[PDB]
């Protein structure tokens, strides 16, 4: 039941935001009463803390030729669930008591990603210097986190997965030989 | 009074979200009784709608009031440094807005993307930029979208990696690569 609660809370928090999600919403999703969720399992802030922990573990788990770099980006676009991306973007509204623990998780994610990108950086195949390459890729990822947070909700074609992939691949074709 | 109420509601909705903000919070922010909000609005949903419309107007005004290559560096610098954080935060939270606003928000999002695209592309000059026009505009639009993400995180967590100056320096370094 605990796993089912966290799985459904991630869906709900991503759709409505922390402030817009109630214990009644979460409890109804797993067929229990709102007071039973609170007393048998956890208050809302702790369910959110556990959902965010599951989110960071999902992104850590998820994570060196040029073809390999294209595939890393393809998987990020097509294999990463938008509810986890949306939950991640929404961290900027997290309850204040969780600020420090979330900041630590963000710093770890950022370091891990940087270290992976350094493994792909090869100036014999990339016409950017190291920092510009790393920064460009990080901007592609952050752009997708932004677009995916809007994509499903509004279905605007400009925010779609294949349009993003094709814009990114066009730019990579220019800088990666 | 309406300008005051909306300015204050944007601050509250950006910080607490739609459901997290109450009419009492809004009325208290401008020093009036809750009942007095009804001289101008019918409910919280309408105040949020007006707040979102104000938000879109703010971004269009900003983009249109802020075409040489150095003018492009300046545009980007001003977007990063001068766009009000509360508006970026309200904007990113539009994907979790009340269902009744879905079509209105969708259409405004489409209009802002078209406006930015059409405005920023005026800075394209093939004698100076090595990228073609399409790749140039797509990359510039991604710098703007990346800032919505970074600004929200920098404000909340203070991660140096997300700061105004750091981002501006990374953007300038990429613009330099794009120039011949």
Curated annotation (Swiss-Prot), chain A:
Residue intervals annotated as DNA-binding region are 22-41
Question: What is its induction?
Answer: Repressed by ethanol.
Tell me what effect the entry lists for residue 23 to T: One-third decrease in DNA-binding affinity
What this protein is reported to do is described as:
Represses transcription of the icaADBC operon necessary for biofilm production.
InterPro entries from the entry? Homeodomain-like_sf (IPR009057), HTH-type_Tx_Regulator (IPR050624), HTH_TetR (IPR001647), IcaR_C (IPR041646)
What is this protein called in UniProt? Biofilm operon icaADBC HTH-type negative transcriptional regulator IcaR
Repeat among keywords: no
Q: What else is known?
A: Binding to the ica operator DNA involves two IcaR dimers and is highly cooperative. Two aminoglycoside antibiotics, namely, gentamicin and streptomycin, show an inhibitory effect on the IcaR-DNA interactions. Consequently, by interfering with the binding of IcaR to DNA, aminoglycoside gentamicin and other antibiotics may activate the icaADBC genes and elicit biofilm production in S.epidermidis, as a defense mechanism. The four antibiotics kanamycin, tetracycline, ampicillin and chloramphenicol do not show significant effect on the IcaR-DNA binding.
Loss of this gene results in the following: Cells lacking this gene display a 5.8-fold increase in ica operon expression.
Q: Which UniProt keywords apply?
A: DNA-binding, Repressor, Transcription, Transcription regulation
- PANTHER family reported for this sequence: ACREF/ENVCD OPERON REPRESSOR-RELATED (PTHR43479), ACREF_ENVCD OPERON REPRESSOR-RELATED (PTHR43479:SF11)
Q: Which domain of life is it from?
A: Bacteria
- What is this protein's gene name? icaR
Q: Which is one GO molecular function term here? A: DNA binding
Give disulfide pairs as residue numbers. Answer: none
Q: Identify the species of origin.
A: Staphylococcus epidermidis (strain ATCC 35984 / DSM 28319 / BCRC 17069 / CCUG 31568 / BM 3577 / RP62A)
**Tell me, how does this one assemble?**
Homodimer.
Residue ranges annotated for the HTH tetR-type domain, each copy included: 1-59
The yes or no answer to whether the keyword Transferase is present is no
């Amino acid at each position: 039941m605990k796993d089912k609660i966290i799985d459904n809370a991630i869906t709900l928090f991503s759709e409505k935001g922390y402030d817009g999600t109630t214990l009644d919403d979460i409890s109804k999703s797993v067929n229990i009463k709102k007071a039973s969720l609170y007393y048998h399992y956890d208050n809302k802030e702790e369910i959110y803390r556990k959902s965010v922990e599951n989110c960071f573990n999902y992104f850590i788990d998820f994570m060196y030729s040029i073809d390999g770099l294209y595939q890393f980006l393809f998987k990020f676009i097509f294999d990463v669930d938008e509810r986890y991306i949306k939950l991640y973007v929404q961290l900027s509204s997290a309850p204040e008591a969780l600020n420090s623990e979330i900041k630590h998780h963000l710093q770890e994610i950022n370091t891990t990603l940087h270290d992976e990108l350094i493994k792909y950086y090869d100036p014999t195949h990339i016409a950017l210097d190291k920092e510009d390459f790393i920064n460009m890729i990080l901007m592609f990822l952050e752009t997708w986190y932004f677009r995916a947070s809007f994509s499903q909700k509004f279905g605007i074609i400009e925010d779609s997965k294949n349009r993003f992939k094709d814009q990114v691949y066009s730019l990579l074709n220019v800088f990666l030989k």
